[PDB]
């Protein structure tokens, strides 16, 4: 009913195109800015768009095949290989953008509040360690159910695999949902807190590019919460209320599609919706 | 440049002994180090190699698992911890330096050596002894089981001269290049698996044993040895 | 009185030289070389990219074996590269980080560098200790060292910002010959293939031909409108090319004592930092401030190709002695190796 | 008397440059054209070598 | 890859390790280019804070490297310094126009389009005495000073003569007018009034360097 092939195809199509454009722009921009400084923001932003590109590609491709297979998971995934792979990708595709945004907020909070310390003490090695440390931490959490002998179960829509949310019994079963929501909300909270300190300091310092950055911070804070709060709270709701929660299939499916747009809008909120970027895109289309 | 070895002596079979090589007069940390032993009335045999910075270590099959090679760059000392010593381990152990870059000369310097007493590509030197006279040109031939000419154009063949009672001395590296401090009369030529060393206007100092060593791949294997005698 | 009379004679001599050049300017290189076929489009791909410098690269110089090269960067590092395998053979830390030029000895035993410290330091690459050490510090220039070139292991010619060039005896550390006559800072010098003459370019928009053994200026070439930043001899030594801030390259002839051809385009407005010739001299390669490197048909003044692979100003370029490849440095701290494909 | 000494030096230098033998430009132009034609075959940048003969594959 | 090629490539990577370690140590200090005329007195500013003269001073555990070179060509070497310390003598009205033209060449340099200048209008004690004496008039050299009035938004220091404040604001405005004439925010001038006994020059550089680096980050975060 509410689910269809075209809904995931359109999100996959638009999400891939948005991230591909941001990667190309980040390629040229990084070369220009790596000469001036270490360009730590451009490194993290490149990882965020690259990670989101694989999330839209890996998870989007599986869903189209599932829809084309009439959702017959028993007939085509009897060994449960696809669902476990599907579950791992879904956790990584969502936990990594949230953790990267949290680190991207802390990095630019130091870069604004203590620009000298961010330049003389923080090195290019540390930025790549944080970029790799976040991705490794997201893989560790994604592989945690596998190492805990658990598995990812097929969701109610029968078109995506994720944590076990229906009829949770064991304390470890609810632990994974709580951990994912706790990490998702903690990353959301630090992202809001650090983007606020950056915005508050800039306005006090301002009173050239301060208003452009402040508008950017507001777009980051609003999009990251309007999209991820409906899904992260729902997982925390199920993890505590269990099956007694009023978490219907339509409620969680809709919360998933909103959280999908966070990775779709990240190329725009971070890269594309910028005054310098938009000017180049205008001339490129004319040429 | 100096390399002094110590710690050798008479040991019982199955025991352990520690060899120390004190390096002075050069940048020790920049040179890869080798241990090469020579059994009494026998040829040279490569034992172990520790690279610059200790990042790469190689051992011979006859000593792998029993010998431990280590270096102390701040103290400029090279160590060789030997365990489970056999009667076959009785030899003179030489501390050898080698630096590797484009156009370098590995095995340029050899240590004095220490005496230890216990109570694959094949290099062929068929002619063990050659009667020679001063002022007469002498040619020494070498053979290899595998073609030493690599795809990068280099032919990794090395020539060493061991005068009686002294450490071996590098003459030719990579089959054609004359080492620094070596008289121009020595010349090396070869192609594929056959090589020749020519000694024009032989003198008294040219008397010694000549070994051909390959450096195409590990382990590093020497020849039997060709002796020039008056 | 006497000074007024003398300065009028100098003006007459300038007219005498100027009239003589017009007398022998019977034809133009464009008219002579109009018949020959064009070289077509010169397509060179980046075969290698040399990474490892952490600041702007000021100068590079190929070795005579066409495989080793030395680059100088303002991070205080003189790095010797193996261009075939991109390996770093040596890393020489400099006492002063403001290095502006680098030289590779034709024997390969030494490298030289110098910058704002007014010292041309000589480094010995072949030591028994296994490390590169400073062998000689050539002091005596009162300005920044802008270029230096080896003649042998004991002779090196350096151009300075004090408007003087010098020939040094490395063994004694003293300058055998001092070259004077430039009114502006000398920015470059090019040794002739026989190493008996060398041209120098200065900020006074003039190129002077010097005799190394004699020690005096033989010819003076003008025509540029701003500072000359790069000078390069023709392969046979009977001509040379210059690059200046007026966005033009000029081919000067030694025997004819006058400019033969100008290499300029309307789209090009940026200064020229480096110039070099191919092995046959048919192609002129010039580095510009628009981050590109243009390949010119030296005989027809046509832009044969573009080497656009750098993200900052192309500070230097060089062609190997065998002419197989061209290396371009830039302020983006990257060196690229270029050559064509069949 | 620094200026008067410099004026003599400049005049003396200009005399030497005016007394050199200057050949015709067409003669000098042909020499460059002849050299480029003679060495055209041995110019890897002008005439790209086969990939087997390129040290920078 | 042969046995010696591998050992050579291992040597290269060890060299790569020491290259990157030296770059990290290089970035732990901020590089300052010191400029000024013969009468500027920039040496006294250096000594109080403490052919190339280099000085190192520390402010809040931050190390500054200041280069005093003793120029359109060699100025390109300092293409990536944090700031240029341009020191002028404001008391010398005769040589003020020399400083203004000197400042304009540095500001409009093609290779200094992104370098911010920390202007030190040195010798304010001499400037105050010169205005009080009245022997020399700024209007003699600058005709527009007669019609120049101190803005109502000015904040002169307590116990400062209005004649001194009017002179200081006009001298400062001449340099700032050059700075705002071109650049479009790529670099900013930071004028300050110092004397021969002031001990806050080092801290003024530290506070101005923070804004220079902060503006550098804002371009990276925005001009993607
Ligand atoms: C938990 C975090 C999930 C975010 C993953 C990533 O950001 C986006 C994944 C999207 C993916 C959603 C996975 C299953 C779709 C179920 C909705 C249906 O079948 O209608 C595809 O719709 C395409 C892609 O845009």
mmCIF file of C-alpha atoms in Angstrom, chain C residues 16 93 106 111 341:
data_model
loop_
_atom_site.group_PDB
_atom_site.id
_atom_site.type_symbol
_atom_site.label_atom_id
_atom_site.label_comp_id
_atom_site.label_asym_id
_atom_site.label_seq_id
_atom_site.Cartn_x
_atom_site.Cartn_y
_atom_site.Cartn_z
ATOM 1 C CA UNK C 16 75.214 52.316 -33.671
ATOM 2 C CA UNK C 93 67.704 19.430 5.629
ATOM 3 C CA UNK C 106 76.764 16.723 -13.979
ATOM 4 C CA UNK C 111 74.061 19.224 -5.234
ATOM 5 C CA UNK C 341 52.332 8.434 -26.296
#
